[PDB]
Design a protein around this ligand. Structure first.
Ligand SMILES: [Mg+2]
Ligand SMILES: [Mg+2]
Ligand SMILES: [Mg+2]
Ligand SMILES: [Mg+2]
Ligand SMILES: [Mg+2]
Ligand SMILES: [Mg+2]
Ligand SMILES: [Mg+2]
Ligand SMILES: [Mg+2]
Ligand SMILES: [Mg+2]
Ligand SMILES: [Mg+2]
Ligand SMILES: [Mg+2]
Ligand SMILES: [Mg+2]
Ligand SMILES: [Mg+2]
Ligand SMILES: [Mg+2]
Ligand SMILES: [Mg+2]
Ligand SMILES: [Mg+2]
Ligand SMILES: [Mg+2]
Ligand SMILES: [Mg+2]
Ligand SMILES: [Mg+2]
Ligand SMILES: [Mg+2]
Ligand SMILES: [Mg+2]
Ligand SMILES: [Mg+2]
Ligand SMILES: [Mg+2]
Ligand SMILES: [Mg+2]
Ligand SMILES: [Mg+2]
Ligand SMILES: [Mg+2]
Ligand SMILES: [Mg+2]
Ligand SMILES: [Mg+2]
Ligand SMILES: [Mg+2]
Ligand SMILES: [Mg+2]
Ligand SMILES: [Mg+2]
Lengths: 117, 200, 144, 63
RNA sequence: UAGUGGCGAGCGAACGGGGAUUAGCCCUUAAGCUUCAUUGAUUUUAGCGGAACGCUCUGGAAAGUGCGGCCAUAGUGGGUGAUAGCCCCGUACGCGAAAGGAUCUUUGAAGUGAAAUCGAGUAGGACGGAGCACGAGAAACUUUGUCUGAACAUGGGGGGACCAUCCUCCAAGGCUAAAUACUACUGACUGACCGAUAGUGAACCAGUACCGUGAGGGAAAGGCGAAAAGAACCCCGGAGAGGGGAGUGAAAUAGAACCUGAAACCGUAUGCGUACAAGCAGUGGGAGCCUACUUGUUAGGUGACUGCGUACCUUUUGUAUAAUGGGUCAGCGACUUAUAUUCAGUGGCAAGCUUAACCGUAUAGGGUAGGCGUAGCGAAAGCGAGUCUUAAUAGGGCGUUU
RNA sequence: UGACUGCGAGACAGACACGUCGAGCAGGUACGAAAGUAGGUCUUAGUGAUCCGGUGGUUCUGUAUGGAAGGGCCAUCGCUC
């Protein structure tokens, strides 16, 4: 009939505080402060799954720009050339070539330069 | 239909009673109604009105900086009233007479279909000795058994009183819960006929 | 069949609403009561017939009629109910024995509703033209 | 305890098979200035409007 | 429901019916009741007896494991070193009172009922109140503060204004059990009641401490261990407090503020980071370092640097808002319950369905008084698959083909 | 004397309560030779729910019965509410 909340409530609070591990001050010790931090960190994490894809693409495009300008092309002209010559290598792989396989990246840039003119 | 008797030959019983379909939702309602009918319902708590003291306002409504309080027996307070304090109430549901009989018919038909009904020509013990009843039920190979007789014998009642998993009931005393709980339902031929008159 | 193997049919029994038990329940923090106003308050109920202070319908309209005290001892017995009487004679006391009229009923009238199964005698009981024809068609008769 | 019917509502709304009957307003005491057509068409009973049934059904303790 | 009601909010019968109980006696003096004898029955206030188990394993300890028995009108009781029908106390069952109380009874005695002798300042009336469901209403009836005031069974009262007829009763004198109400108190039994912030305010030396002139208000506070076996003795220390050994114990981080021993909060140790750096303190990316193995597409800890990023609740058109609330933790804290009812779902039965009180060796079965349905229309008399309106069988309203 | 009596298919309007228009049928009229027209006024303001009480009718009811009272129904009166 009478239901004590102590055991269930302790399990709830401990799950939140375990998620607040590593947080500063009351954000890792105090439940009603840690609860807000765990929710906000979750809001950030959801939003940063989207932002990670943007951040990495901006990083690939910048490295492709640097790599292609070493080969006499800007990023915009290289992408247009990679569409004129039907090359579907994506920017993640292109940015890996521009750093790690520079001879392979030079061959692709020359293939884009030839396609443009 | 035909109900086999351990001693004598098979007898003919009513299809309505011993061969109907199993209405599980109706049997469930009768079992739930029967268990609700056995509750004492005897408890209470105290509301804010019934807890000792608490007539005076603990402090003035404005100025002290505290949250406003009307009584120290507010259910918000430690030692105060129970918000919705229980009072002794009855838990018995109403079961229609025919609803009860239909559940009994379902239980009896299902007991026959599950081989959990044992029919014997008669069941009497001579002396009120538990050892005698144990010997009788061991010949029939029964350990957890409800014994249903047309008239509960005085010696039979005494002999089964201390037995661990044995219950002796009159036909009128065979509730839906005991017909389902016990592993077997040993029933005399007289009680089978008395069942037929009641439920058919 | 077992005590731990018994269910009611799907939809026979349901959980009750439990308001104010968190966000996920769908009834948290107001209990479906909205935000403010009388209807949200504890004990907040609008009286039956209350129209906001406008003249209520139960007072715009006039009182009419009177109740009939003479009609409190009367009952109507259908022709389909005459066959359920015992003893082939339909009377005031015989209709009470059959539980077709109440004990306080002092005058009975029969009207055509259903078929008179068997020939019966109506003793001290009035009938309509259609009921009288149907009763006499089945072989019945009337006595003062 | 058992519900108490509003006395005033029961005196103005008769329950028949088909709804609740009631008389009409505006037939009480200022009748010379009213046309015969208006007074004749305001005479008799009428069934309760759809929007007023639930409210009156609650005033009477039929719901 | 009838009725009542600023006919508002509300209040709210009776007749009739079903039940529980049942009882009637007198004023030409009784049924009863009380008291004191008295004859027998029980009952209560102490008690008595009360069955039947061993070996084995783990274990501090056996009641638990395994094997094999026995008692049961006694098997889900409480304990005993962990969970016992057979170890103890009990339990079913059967016995028991020197003495006192009580209840039924059989007789007897007075006492009372007892008002004496059939009802006069009474019935009726006027005024003003009260009660009758009835608030003056067309207001009967009861009752009486003021004032009046009959008749004598050939009479009188009532039947809801009032009158006549009819029916029914006999007021102004009394006594009367049962069915009904309650529980401060005593006992037993029980609980889909609580289990120390709960449950009584009060598990504890609680109506106490304490507060108040006073009436009055009114707490907090349970647990070592199976058993004190409650730590002999030695050492530091003030012949302290508190400790370190020793010992006891199954266990002492069970050491008396003693079961478990959470969180806030406060420390010590180690690892990494941190003194050119601007903000809800995270999140995405990410080097280095440390640790451990799986020896680098690994796990854990830290996290330089960097993108993005103004808590939560409430209330609002709108809140980072410099609007509200919260110092934190732990515990408690808010849609319940009863009775009537409507709709839905899911069952039983079906032109029928269902009982209430109540009875009932009692969740059964009986009880069908009642409620709803099978017919409507009409304010109603009434008529009736029709009815109402109307001069109208015409139109129209509602109803009828389930 | 149609500023008629019973109604009324069908609409407009509209939260409700109210409101507006109305062919046609019946009864009984007026005017016109007749077809016809007339259920007020060229139209749109001139109004007030319920309760309560009053007045005229009424085949309804009538607390044992017959009456009556009282109630219902139809008509109508009393609010610068
Ligand atoms: Mg309490
Ligand atoms: Mg029953
Ligand atoms: Mg929502
Ligand atoms: Mg709010
Ligand atoms: Mg608002
Ligand atoms: Mg609102
Ligand atoms: Mg009946
Ligand atoms: Mg009128
Ligand atoms: Mg013993
Ligand atoms: Mg232990
Ligand atoms: Mg007398
Ligand atoms: Mg008098
Ligand atoms: Mg009198
Ligand atoms: Mg009378
Ligand atoms: Mg007398
Ligand atoms: Mg307490
Ligand atoms: Mg505790
Ligand atoms: Mg030792
Ligand atoms: Mg312990
Ligand atoms: Mg401890
Ligand atoms: Mg630095
Ligand atoms: Mg700073
Ligand atoms: Mg990362
Ligand atoms: Mg930023
Ligand atoms: Mg504002
Ligand atoms: Mg904003
Ligand atoms: Mg703020
Ligand atoms: Mg600020
Ligand atoms: Mg604050
Ligand atoms: Mg009369
Ligand atoms: Mg009249």
């Amino acid at each position: 009939a009478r239901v004590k909340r102590g055991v269930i409530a302790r399990r709830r609070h401990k799950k939140i505080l375990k998620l607040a591990k590593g947080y500063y001050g009351a954000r890792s010790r105090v439940f009603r402060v840690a609860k807000q931090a765990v929710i906000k960190a979750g809001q950030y994490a959801y939003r940063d799954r989207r932002q990670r894809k943007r951040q990495f693409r901006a990083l690939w495009i910048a490295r492709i720009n640097a790599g292609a300008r070493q080969n006499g092309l800007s990023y915009s002209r290289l992408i247009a050339g990679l569409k004129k010559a039907a090359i579907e290598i994506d920017r993640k792989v292109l940015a890996d070539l521009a750093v790690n396989e520079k001879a392979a990246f030079t061959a692709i840039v020359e293939k884009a330069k030839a396609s443009l003119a | 239909m035909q109900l086999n008797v351990n001693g004598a030959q098979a007898i003919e019983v009513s299809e309505r009673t011993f061969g109907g379909e199993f209405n599980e939702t109706l049997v469930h309602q009768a079992v739930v109604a029967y268990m609700a009918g056995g509750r004492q319902g005897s408890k209470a708590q105290k509301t804010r009105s019934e807890v000792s003291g608490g007539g005076k306002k603990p402090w003035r409504q404005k100025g002290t900086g505290r949250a406003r309080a009307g009584t120290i027996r507010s259910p918000i307070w430690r030692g105060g009233g129970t918000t919705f304090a229980a009072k002794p109430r009855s838990h018995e549901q109403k079961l229609n007479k025919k609803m009860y009989r239909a559940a009994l018919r379902s239980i009896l038909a299902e007991l026959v279909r599950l081989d959990r009904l044992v029919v014997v020509a008669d069941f009497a013990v001579d002396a009120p000795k538990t050892k005698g009843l144990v010997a009788k039920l061991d010949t029939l190979g029964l350990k957890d058994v409800l014994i249903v007789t047309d008239g509960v014998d005085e010696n039979l009642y005494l002999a089964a009183r201390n037995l661990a998993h044995v219950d002796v009931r009159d036909v009128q005393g065979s509730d839906p819960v005991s017909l389902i709980a016990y592993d077997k339902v040993l029933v005399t031929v007289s009680a089978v006929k008395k069942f037929e008159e009641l439920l058919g | 069949m077992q005590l731990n193997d018994l269910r009611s049919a799907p939809g026979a029994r349901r959980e009750k609403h439990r308001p104010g038990r968190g966000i996920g329940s769908g009834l948290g923090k107001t209990g479906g009561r909205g935000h403010k106003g009388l209807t949200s308050r504890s004990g907040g109920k609008v009286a039956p017939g209350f129209e906001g202070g406008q003249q209520p319908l139960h007072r715009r309209l006039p009182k009419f009629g009177f109740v009939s005290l003479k009609a409190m001892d009367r009952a109507e017995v259908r022709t389909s109910e005459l066959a359920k009487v015992e003893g082939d004679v339909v009377s005031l006391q015989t209709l009470k024995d059959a539980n077709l009229i109440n004990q306080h009923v002092q005058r009975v009238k029969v009207m055509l509703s259903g078929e008179v199964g068997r020939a019966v005698t109506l003793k001290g009981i009035a009938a309509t033209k259609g009921a009288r024809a149907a009763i006499e068609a089945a072989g019945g008769k009337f006595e003062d | 305890p058992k519900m108490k019917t509003k006395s005033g509502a029961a005196k103005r709304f008769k329950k028949t098979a088909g709804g609740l009957k009631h008389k009409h307003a505006f037939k009480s005491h200022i009748l010379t200035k009213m046309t015969t057509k208006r007074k004749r068409q305001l005479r008799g009973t009428s069934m309760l409007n759809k929007s007023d049934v639930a409210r009156v059904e609650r005033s009477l303790r039929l719901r």
